[PDB]
Amino acid sequence: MSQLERNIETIINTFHQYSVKLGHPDTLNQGEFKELVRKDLQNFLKKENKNEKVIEHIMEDLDTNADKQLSFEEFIMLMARLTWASHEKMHEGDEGPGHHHKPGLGE
Amino acid sequence: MSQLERNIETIINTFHQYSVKLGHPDTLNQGEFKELVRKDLQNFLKKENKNEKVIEHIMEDLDTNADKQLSFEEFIMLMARLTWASHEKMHEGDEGPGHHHKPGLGE
Amino acid sequence: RSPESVAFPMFQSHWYSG
Amino acid sequence: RSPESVAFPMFQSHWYSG
Amino acid sequence: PMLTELEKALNSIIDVYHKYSLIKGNFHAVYRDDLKKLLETESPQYIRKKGADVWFKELDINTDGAVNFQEFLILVIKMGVAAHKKSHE
Amino acid sequence: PMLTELEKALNSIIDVYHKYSLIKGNFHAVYRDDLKKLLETESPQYIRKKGADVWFKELDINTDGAVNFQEFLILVIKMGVAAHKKSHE
Ligand SMILES: *C(=O)c1ccc(C(=O)O)c(-c2c3ccc(=O)cc-3oc3cc(O)ccc23)c1
Ligand SMILES: *C(=O)c1ccc(C(=O)O)c(-c2c3ccc(=O)cc-3oc3cc(O)ccc23)c1
Ligand SMILES: [Ca+2]
Ligand SMILES: [Ca+2]
Ligand SMILES: [Ca+2]
Ligand SMILES: [Ca+2]
Ligand SMILES: [Ca+2]
Ligand SMILES: [Ca+2]
Ligand SMILES: [K+]
Ligand SMILES: [K+]
Ligand SMILES: [N]
Ligand SMILES: [N]
Ligand code: NA
Ligand code: NA
Ligand code: NI
Ligand code: NI
């Protein structure tokens, strides 16, 4: 198991922790998504987590087939966005030269 | 010619306005890129344009083959990012419900 | 844990039915 | 303008040579 | 202030995508049928000739049955690169 | 505060990409040869079997000869979707 595979494993295991609780066991409903986000994105989504309605629009946006649950396929878009927004913050206001990372999201 | 094709035409025509001025006529060197950005991204990159070194790191980042010019292939990554960052600002702090756009970048 | 055979059904209706 | 036959050569070395 | 023509171009690309994403369903989702309408209306023949379903398979990177905005930007990037090469024929 | 394991996972994906992007050249560019090293070291067999060059053609959406970070996220998304389906076998 590589570093990337392990990270992938952690995304899948975290999704499964909340998807199994209610309704479809392989999808996240509004309440399960709120719980995942409150706990396991508590730093990356600190500011959004203070506004339950912001969390609701995020879920509405990720729910690409409009069936009011997040499949894993829909959810991994949020992981990619947060990864991308973390890397962006590492480079926010970068003046160069060369490559350096400031602290990422939730820091 | 469709709306999208016209927009594509404008990206290509704007690139060509500055790429032909010096050196390779189909690429943007540091000085040509600074000029394109100062004039034609004057609103989207208002804050970055106040710091010539920020503009230099952006070019360094887009210059994926490290030959110190931007090809058109490298440049259209910046157009996609700015388009994406404009749409993000239209949805910044969105609470829903449904779909609505606030003003975009440079506004 | 290495997720193998999670044993409940995978969601598969990745399309619009509204 | 609809860019057709801009007539100067297109840059084509889309790879690393450093 | 007033936007430059380049900046208006980028915002208009947003506008284009939403003509199709706002037809039904999720507001940032272009379903397979909407994508055929998008390709046929907004793209040239040398883009369309690929077939709307081959494009849909290429663009739907998470295979959730929709093209979201970032996936549509893949299409925009490929059209721009293609349009640029054609301008050197 | 201390990051959750999920958040550390996302930052680690950043870290992974940079092991290969910082080998040479542009700091956010993974050239074709670096991408083979990435696939062979970081991905499972059912990903690698595609071939590093078929992956490179898929990921380099702007055909500039490099995989930047957003293009690498296409790879990450496809691996996650694949890993999830396999967990239901
Ligand atoms: C699944 O098998 C699993 C569940 C939890 C953990 C964990 O959080 O520690 C791991 C895992 C390890 C398991 C055994 C071991 O000896 C060492 C482990 O190291 C790690 C390190 C990271 O970063 C994540 C997970 C493990 C495995
Ligand atoms: C190229 O042929 C070209 C160059 C400039 C313009 C322009 O900025 O107006 C256009 C173009 C038009 C040309 C002729 C015409 O009768 C109407 C035009 O409308 C537009 C509208 C937009 O939004 C952009 C460009 C043109 C064409
Ligand atoms: Ca559930
Ligand atoms: Ca859904
Ligand atoms: Ca030049
Ligand atoms: Ca270059
Ligand atoms: Ca999709
Ligand atoms: Ca690329
Ligand atoms: K599952
Ligand atoms: K050109
Ligand atoms: N519907
Ligand atoms: N080099
Ligand atoms: Na839609
Ligand atoms: Na590199
Ligand atoms: Ni970086
Ligand atoms: Ni929108």
Coordinates of C-alpha atoms and ligand atoms in Angstrom, one line a residue:
Chain A
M1 CA 0.0 0.0 0.0
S2 CA 1.4 3.3 -1.1
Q3 CA 1.0 6.7 0.5
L4 CA -1.6 7.7 -2.1
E5 CA -3.4 4.4 -1.8
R6 CA -3.5 4.9 2.0
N7 CA -4.9 8.4 1.5
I8 CA -7.5 7.0 -0.9
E9 CA -8.3 4.3 1.7
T10 CA -8.9 7.1 4.3
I11 CA -11.4 8.9 2.1
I12 CA -13.3 5.7 1.4
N13 CA -13.3 4.6 5.1
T14 CA -14.5 8.1 6.2
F15 CA -17.3 8.1 3.7
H16 CA -18.4 4.6 4.8
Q17 CA -18.4 5.7 8.4
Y18 CA -21.3 8.1 7.8
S19 CA -22.9 6.5 4.7
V20 CA -24.0 3.4 6.6
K21 CA -25.8 5.1 9.4
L22 CA -29.2 5.8 7.8
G23 CA -31.1 5.2 4.6
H24 CA -28.9 3.9 1.7
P25 CA -25.8 2.5 3.4
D26 CA -23.6 3.5 0.4
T27 CA -24.7 7.1 0.2
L28 CA -24.7 10.2 2.5
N29 CA -28.0 11.9 3.2
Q30 CA -28.2 15.5 4.4
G31 CA -27.8 14.5 8.1
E32 CA -24.9 12.1 7.5
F33 CA -23.1 14.7 5.4
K34 CA -23.6 17.3 8.1
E35 CA -22.0 14.8 10.6
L36 CA -19.0 13.9 8.4
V37 CA -18.4 17.6 7.7
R38 CA -18.8 18.7 11.4
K39 CA -16.3 16.1 12.6
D40 CA -13.9 15.1 9.9
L41 CA -13.7 18.4 8.0
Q42 CA -13.8 20.4 11.2
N43 CA -10.7 22.4 10.3
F44 CA -10.9 22.6 6.5
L45 CA -14.5 23.7 6.6
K46 CA -14.3 25.6 9.9
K47 CA -16.0 28.7 8.7
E48 CA -18.6 27.0 6.5
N49 CA -19.5 24.7 9.5
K50 CA -20.8 27.8 11.4
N51 CA -23.7 28.2 8.9
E52 CA -25.8 25.1 8.5
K53 CA -27.3 26.7 5.3
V54 CA -23.8 27.0 3.7
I55 CA -23.4 23.3 4.4
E56 CA -26.8 22.6 2.7
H57 CA -25.9 24.5 -0.4
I58 CA -22.6 22.6 -0.7
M59 CA -24.4 19.3 -0.5
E60 CA -27.0 20.6 -3.0
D61 CA -24.2 21.5 -5.3
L62 CA -22.4 18.1 -5.0
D63 CA -25.7 16.2 -5.5
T64 CA -25.3 16.2 -9.3
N65 CA -28.2 13.8 -10.0
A66 CA -30.5 15.7 -7.6
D67 CA -31.6 12.6 -5.7
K68 CA -30.8 14.2 -2.3
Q69 CA -28.0 11.8 -1.4
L70 CA -24.3 12.0 -2.1
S71 CA -22.9 8.9 -3.8
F72 CA -19.2 8.2 -3.4
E73 CA -18.8 9.5 -7.0
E74 CA -20.3 12.9 -6.0
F75 CA -18.4 13.0 -2.7
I76 CA -14.9 12.7 -4.2
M77 CA -15.5 15.9 -6.0
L78 CA -15.6 17.7 -2.6
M79 CA -12.4 16.0 -1.6
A80 CA -10.6 17.1 -4.9
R81 CA -11.9 20.7 -4.4
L82 CA -10.7 20.8 -0.8
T83 CA -7.3 19.4 -1.8
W84 CA -7.1 21.9 -4.5
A85 CA -8.1 24.8 -2.2
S86 CA -5.5 23.6 0.4
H87 CA -2.7 23.7 -2.2
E88 CA -3.9 27.1 -3.3
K89 CA -3.6 28.5 0.2
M90 CA -0.1 27.1 0.5
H91 CA 0.7 29.3 -2.5
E92 CA -1.5 32.3 -1.6
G93 CA 0.2 35.6 -2.4
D94 CA 3.3 33.7 -3.6
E95 CA 6.1 36.0 -4.8
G96 CA 8.6 33.2 -5.7
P97 CA 11.1 32.4 -6.7
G98 CA 11.0 28.7 -6.9
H99 CA 8.6 26.5 -4.9
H100 CA 7.5 26.9 -1.3
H101 CA 4.4 25.9 0.7
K102 CA 2.8 28.0 3.4
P103 CA 0.4 26.2 5.8
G104 CA -2.7 24.8 4.1
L105 CA -6.4 25.0 4.8
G106 CA -7.6 24.9 8.3
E107 CA -4.3 26.3 9.7
Chain B
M1 CA -19.9 31.2 -34.9
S2 CA -21.3 30.4 -31.4
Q3 CA -21.0 32.3 -28.2
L4 CA -18.4 29.9 -26.9
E5 CA -16.5 29.9 -30.2
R6 CA -16.5 33.7 -30.1
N7 CA -15.1 33.7 -26.6
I8 CA -12.5 31.2 -27.7
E9 CA -11.7 33.5 -30.5
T10 CA -11.2 36.4 -28.1
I11 CA -8.7 34.4 -26.0
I12 CA -6.7 33.5 -29.0
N13 CA -6.8 37.0 -30.5
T14 CA -5.7 38.5 -27.2
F15 CA -2.8 36.0 -26.8
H16 CA -1.7 36.8 -30.4
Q17 CA -1.8 40.5 -29.7
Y18 CA 1.1 40.2 -27.2
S19 CA 2.8 37.0 -28.4
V20 CA 3.9 38.6 -31.7
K21 CA 5.7 41.6 -30.2
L22 CA 9.1 40.1 -29.3
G23 CA 11.0 36.9 -29.6
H24 CA 8.9 33.9 -30.6
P25 CA 5.8 35.3 -32.2
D26 CA 3.6 32.4 -31.0
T27 CA 4.7 32.6 -27.3
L28 CA 4.6 35.2 -24.5
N29 CA 7.8 36.1 -22.8
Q30 CA 7.9 37.7 -19.4
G31 CA 7.5 41.2 -20.7
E32 CA 4.7 40.3 -23.1
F33 CA 2.9 38.5 -20.4
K34 CA 3.2 41.4 -18.0
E35 CA 1.6 43.6 -20.7
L36 CA -1.3 41.3 -21.5
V37 CA -2.0 41.0 -17.8
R38 CA -1.7 44.7 -17.0
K39 CA -4.1 45.6 -19.7
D40 CA -6.5 42.8 -20.5
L41 CA -6.7 41.2 -17.0
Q42 CA -6.7 44.6 -15.4
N43 CA -9.8 43.9 -13.4
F44 CA -9.6 40.1 -12.8
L45 CA -6.0 40.4 -11.6
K46 CA -6.3 43.9 -10.1
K47 CA -4.6 43.0 -6.8
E48 CA -1.9 40.7 -8.3
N49 CA -1.0 43.5 -10.8
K50 CA 0.1 45.7 -8.0
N51 CA 3.0 43.4 -7.2
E52 CA 5.3 42.6 -10.2
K53 CA 6.7 39.7 -8.3
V54 CA 3.3 38.0 -7.9
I55 CA 2.9 38.3 -11.7
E56 CA 6.4 36.7 -12.1
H57 CA 5.5 33.7 -9.9
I58 CA 2.2 33.2 -11.9
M59 CA 4.2 33.1 -15.1
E60 CA 6.8 30.8 -13.6
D61 CA 3.9 28.5 -12.5
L62 CA 2.2 28.4 -15.9
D63 CA 5.6 27.8 -17.7
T64 CA 5.2 24.1 -17.4
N65 CA 8.2 23.2 -19.6
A66 CA 10.5 25.8 -17.9
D67 CA 11.6 27.4 -21.2
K68 CA 10.7 31.0 -19.9
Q69 CA 7.9 31.6 -22.4
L70 CA 4.2 30.8 -22.3
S71 CA 2.9 28.8 -25.2
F72 CA -0.8 29.0 -26.0
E73 CA -1.2 25.6 -24.3
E74 CA 0.3 26.9 -21.1
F75 CA -1.6 30.2 -21.3
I76 CA -5.1 28.6 -21.6
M77 CA -4.6 27.1 -18.1
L78 CA -4.6 30.6 -16.7
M79 CA -7.8 31.4 -18.6
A80 CA -9.5 28.3 -17.1
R81 CA -8.4 29.1 -13.6
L82 CA -9.6 32.7 -13.8
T83 CA -12.9 31.5 -15.3
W84 CA -13.2 29.0 -12.5
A85 CA -12.2 31.7 -9.8
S86 CA -14.8 34.0 -11.3
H87 CA -17.6 31.4 -11.0
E88 CA -16.4 30.6 -7.5
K89 CA -16.9 34.3 -6.5
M90 CA -20.3 34.3 -8.0
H91 CA -21.1 31.6 -5.5
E92 CA -19.0 32.8 -2.5
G93 CA -20.8 32.3 0.8
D94 CA -23.8 30.9 -1.0
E95 CA -26.6 29.8 1.3
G96 CA -29.0 28.7 -1.4
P97 CA -31.5 27.5 -2.1
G98 CA -31.3 26.9 -5.8
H99 CA -28.9 28.7 -8.2
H100 CA -27.9 32.4 -8.1
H101 CA -24.8 34.3 -9.3
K102 CA -23.3 37.3 -7.4
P103 CA -20.9 39.5 -9.3
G104 CA -17.8 37.7 -10.5
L105 CA -14.1 38.5 -10.4
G106 CA -12.9 42.1 -10.7
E107 CA -16.3 43.5 -9.6
Chain C
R1 CA -8.8 -1.1 7.6
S2 CA -8.3 -2.0 4.0
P3 CA -11.9 -1.8 2.6
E4 CA -12.6 -5.2 1.0
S5 CA -16.1 -6.7 0.6
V6 CA -18.0 -4.1 2.6
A7 CA -20.9 -6.4 1.8
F8 CA -23.7 -3.8 1.6
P9 CA -24.9 -2.8 -1.9
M10 CA -23.1 -0.1 -3.8
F11 CA -25.2 2.8 -5.1
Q12 CA -25.3 2.6 -8.9
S13 CA -28.0 5.0 -10.2
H14 CA -25.5 7.7 -11.4
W15 CA -28.0 9.5 -13.6
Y16 CA -30.9 11.9 -13.4
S17 CA -34.4 10.5 -12.7
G18 CA -36.3 13.6 -11.6
Chain D
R1 CA -11.2 38.9 -36.6
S2 CA -11.6 35.1 -37.0
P3 CA -7.9 33.9 -36.7
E4 CA -7.2 31.9 -39.9
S5 CA -3.7 31.5 -41.3
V6 CA -1.9 33.7 -38.8
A7 CA 1.1 32.9 -41.0
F8 CA 3.9 32.9 -38.4
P9 CA 5.1 29.6 -37.0
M10 CA 3.3 27.9 -34.1
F11 CA 5.4 27.0 -31.1
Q12 CA 5.5 23.2 -30.9
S13 CA 8.2 22.1 -28.3
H14 CA 5.7 21.1 -25.6
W15 CA 8.2 19.2 -23.5
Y16 CA 11.1 19.7 -21.1
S17 CA 14.5 20.3 -22.5
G18 CA 16.3 21.7 -19.5
Chain E
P1 CA -15.1 49.2 -13.7
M2 CA -15.9 48.0 -17.2
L3 CA -14.4 44.6 -17.9
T4 CA -12.0 44.0 -20.7
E5 CA -13.0 42.0 -23.7
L6 CA -10.8 39.1 -22.4
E7 CA -12.5 39.2 -19.0
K8 CA -16.0 39.4 -20.5
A9 CA -15.0 36.4 -22.6
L10 CA -14.2 34.3 -19.5
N11 CA -17.4 35.3 -17.8
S12 CA -19.3 34.5 -21.0
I13 CA -17.9 31.0 -20.8
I14 CA -19.5 30.7 -17.4
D15 CA -22.7 32.0 -19.0
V16 CA -22.6 29.5 -21.8
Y17 CA -22.2 26.5 -19.5
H18 CA -25.2 27.6 -17.4
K19 CA -27.5 27.7 -20.5
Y20 CA -27.3 24.0 -20.4
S21 CA -26.7 23.2 -16.7
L22 CA -29.8 25.2 -15.8
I23 CA -32.1 23.2 -18.1
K24 CA -33.0 20.6 -15.4
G25 CA -31.8 18.9 -12.3
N26 CA -28.7 20.1 -10.4
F27 CA -27.8 23.6 -11.4
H28 CA -24.1 22.7 -12.0
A29 CA -24.8 19.4 -13.8
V30 CA -25.0 18.9 -17.6
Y31 CA -26.5 15.5 -18.2
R32 CA -25.7 13.4 -21.3
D33 CA -28.6 14.8 -23.3
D34 CA -27.9 18.4 -22.4
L35 CA -24.2 17.8 -23.5
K36 CA -25.3 16.9 -27.0
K37 CA -27.3 20.1 -27.2
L38 CA -24.2 22.0 -25.9
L39 CA -21.8 20.4 -28.4
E40 CA -24.2 20.8 -31.4
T41 CA -24.9 24.4 -30.6
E42 CA -21.6 25.8 -29.2
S43 CA -18.8 23.8 -30.8
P44 CA -17.5 23.4 -34.4
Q45 CA -17.7 20.4 -36.6
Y46 CA -14.2 19.1 -35.8
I47 CA -15.2 19.1 -32.1
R48 CA -18.7 17.6 -32.7
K49 CA -17.4 14.8 -35.0
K50 CA -16.1 13.1 -31.9
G51 CA -19.7 12.2 -30.9
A52 CA -21.5 13.6 -27.9
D53 CA -21.2 10.3 -26.0
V54 CA -17.5 9.9 -26.5
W55 CA -17.2 13.5 -25.2
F56 CA -19.4 12.7 -22.2
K57 CA -17.3 9.7 -21.3
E58 CA -14.2 11.9 -21.5
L59 CA -15.5 14.8 -19.5
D60 CA -17.3 12.9 -16.7
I61 CA -14.2 12.1 -14.8
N62 CA -16.0 11.0 -11.6
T63 CA -18.6 9.0 -13.6
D64 CA -21.5 10.5 -11.7
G65 CA -23.5 10.9 -14.9
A66 CA -23.1 14.7 -15.1
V67 CA -20.5 17.2 -16.4
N68 CA -20.0 19.8 -13.6
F69 CA -18.4 23.2 -14.3
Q70 CA -14.8 22.0 -13.7
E71 CA -15.4 19.1 -16.0
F72 CA -16.8 21.5 -18.7
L73 CA -13.6 23.5 -18.4
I74 CA -11.8 20.4 -19.7
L75 CA -13.9 20.7 -22.9
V76 CA -13.1 24.5 -23.0
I77 CA -9.4 23.9 -22.7
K78 CA -9.4 21.3 -25.5
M79 CA -11.5 23.5 -27.8
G80 CA -9.1 26.4 -27.2
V81 CA -6.0 24.3 -28.0
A82 CA -7.6 22.9 -31.1
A83 CA -8.8 26.4 -32.2
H84 CA -5.3 27.7 -31.8
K85 CA -3.7 25.0 -33.9
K86 CA -6.3 25.5 -36.6
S87 CA -5.3 29.2 -36.7
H88 CA -1.9 28.0 -37.9
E89 CA -3.2 26.1 -40.9
Chain F
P1 CA -5.6 22.7 15.8
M2 CA -4.6 19.1 14.9
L3 CA -6.0 18.0 11.6
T4 CA -8.4 15.2 11.2
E5 CA -7.3 12.0 9.5
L6 CA -9.4 12.9 6.5
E7 CA -7.8 16.4 6.3
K8 CA -4.3 15.0 6.7
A9 CA -5.2 12.6 3.9
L10 CA -6.1 15.4 1.5
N11 CA -2.9 17.4 2.4
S12 CA -0.9 14.1 1.9
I13 CA -2.2 13.9 -1.7
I14 CA -0.6 17.3 -2.2
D15 CA 2.6 15.9 -0.7
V16 CA 2.5 12.8 -3.0
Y17 CA 2.2 14.9 -6.2
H18 CA 5.1 17.1 -5.2
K19 CA 7.5 14.1 -4.7
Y20 CA 7.3 13.8 -8.5
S21 CA 6.6 17.4 -9.6
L22 CA 9.7 18.6 -7.7
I23 CA 12.1 16.1 -9.4
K24 CA 13.0 18.6 -12.2
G25 CA 11.8 21.5 -14.3
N26 CA 8.6 23.4 -13.3
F27 CA 7.6 22.8 -9.7
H28 CA 4.0 22.0 -10.6
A29 CA 4.8 19.9 -13.7
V30 CA 5.0 16.1 -13.9
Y31 CA 6.7 15.1 -17.1
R32 CA 5.9 11.8 -18.9
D33 CA 8.9 10.0 -17.3
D34 CA 8.0 11.3 -13.8
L35 CA 4.4 10.1 -14.3
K36 CA 5.6 6.6 -14.9
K37 CA 7.5 6.7 -11.7
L38 CA 4.4 8.1 -10.0
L39 CA 2.0 5.4 -11.3
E40 CA 4.4 2.5 -10.7
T41 CA 5.1 3.7 -7.1
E42 CA 1.8 5.1 -5.9
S43 CA -1.0 3.3 -7.8
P44 CA -2.2 -0.4 -7.8
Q45 CA -1.9 -2.8 -10.7
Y46 CA -5.4 -2.3 -12.0
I47 CA -4.5 1.4 -12.4
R48 CA -1.0 0.8 -13.8
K49 CA -2.1 -1.8 -16.3
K50 CA -3.5 1.1 -18.4
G51 CA 0.1 2.1 -19.3
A52 CA 1.9 5.3 -18.2
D53 CA 1.6 6.8 -21.7
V54 CA -2.1 6.2 -22.0
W55 CA -2.5 7.8 -18.6
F56 CA -0.3 10.7 -19.7
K57 CA -2.4 11.4 -22.8
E58 CA -5.5 11.2 -20.7
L59 CA -4.3 13.6 -18.0
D60 CA -2.5 16.2 -20.1
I61 CA -5.7 18.0 -21.1
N62 CA -3.9 21.1 -22.5
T63 CA -1.2 19.0 -24.3
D64 CA 1.6 21.0 -22.9
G65 CA 3.7 17.9 -22.1
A66 CA 3.2 18.0 -18.3
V67 CA 0.6 17.0 -15.7
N68 CA 0.0 20.0 -13.4
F69 CA -1.7 19.6 -10.0
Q70 CA -5.3 20.0 -11.3
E71 CA -4.6 17.4 -14.0
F72 CA -3.2 15.1 -11.3
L73 CA -6.5 15.5 -9.4
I74 CA -8.2 13.8 -12.4
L75 CA -6.0 10.8 -11.7
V76 CA -6.8 10.9 -8.0
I77 CA -10.5 11.1 -8.7
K78 CA -10.5 8.1 -11.0
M79 CA -8.4 6.1 -8.5
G80 CA -10.8 6.9 -5.7
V81 CA -13.9 5.9 -7.8
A82 CA -12.1 2.7 -8.8
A83 CA -11.0 1.9 -5.2
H84 CA -14.5 2.4 -4.0
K85 CA -16.1 0.0 -6.6
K86 CA -13.4 -2.6 -5.8
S87 CA -14.4 -2.4 -2.1
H88 CA -17.8 -3.7 -3.2
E89 CA -16.4 -6.9 -4.8
Ligands
LIG1 C1 -6.7 -0.8 8.6 O1 -6.2 -1.8 8.5 C2 -6.1 0.4 9.5 C3 -6.9 1.0 10.4 C4 -6.3 2.0 11.2 C5 -4.9 2.4 11.0 C6 -4.4 3.5 11.9 O2 -5.1 4.5 12.0 O3 -3.4 3.4 12.6 C7 -4.1 1.7 10.1 C8 -2.8 1.9 9.9 C9 -1.8 1.1 10.6 C10 -2.2 -0.2 11.0 C11 -1.3 -1.1 11.7 C12 0.0 -0.6 11.9 O4 0.8 -1.3 12.4 C13 0.4 0.6 11.4 C14 -0.5 1.5 10.8 O5 -0.1 2.7 10.3 C15 -1.0 3.6 9.8 C16 -0.6 4.9 9.4 C17 -1.4 5.8 8.8 O6 -1.0 7.1 8.5 C18 -2.8 5.5 8.6 C19 -3.2 4.2 9.0 C20 -2.3 3.2 9.5 C21 -4.7 0.7 9.3
LIG2 C1 -13.3 39.8 -36.3 O1 -13.8 39.7 -37.4 C2 -14.0 40.8 -35.3 C3 -13.2 41.8 -34.7 C4 -13.8 42.6 -33.8 C5 -15.2 42.5 -33.5 C6 -15.7 43.5 -32.5 O2 -15.0 43.7 -31.4 O3 -16.8 44.1 -32.7 C7 -16.0 41.5 -34.1 C8 -17.3 41.3 -33.8 C9 -18.3 41.9 -34.8 C10 -17.9 42.2 -36.1 C11 -18.8 42.7 -37.0 C12 -20.1 42.9 -36.6 O4 -20.9 43.4 -37.4 C13 -20.5 42.6 -35.3 C14 -19.6 42.1 -34.4 O5 -20.0 41.8 -33.2 C15 -19.1 41.3 -32.2 C16 -19.6 41.1 -30.9 C17 -18.7 40.6 -29.9 O6 -19.2 40.4 -28.6 C18 -17.4 40.4 -30.2 C19 -16.9 40.6 -31.5 C20 -17.8 41.1 -32.5 C21 -15.3 40.7 -35.0
CA3 CA -26.8 6.6 4.2
CA4 CA -26.9 12.2 -5.7
CA5 CA 6.7 36.6 -28.1
CA6 CA 6.9 27.3 -21.6
CA7 CA -19.1 14.4 -13.4
CA8 CA -0.8 19.7 -18.9
K9 K -19.3 2.0 -0.8
K10 K -0.6 31.1 -32.4
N11 N -37.9 15.2 -12.3
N12 N 17.9 21.2 -17.8
NA13 NA -28.5 20.6 -14.7
NA14 NA 8.4 19.2 -12.4
NI15 NI 3.0 23.5 -4.7
NI16 NI -23.3 28.8 -11.1

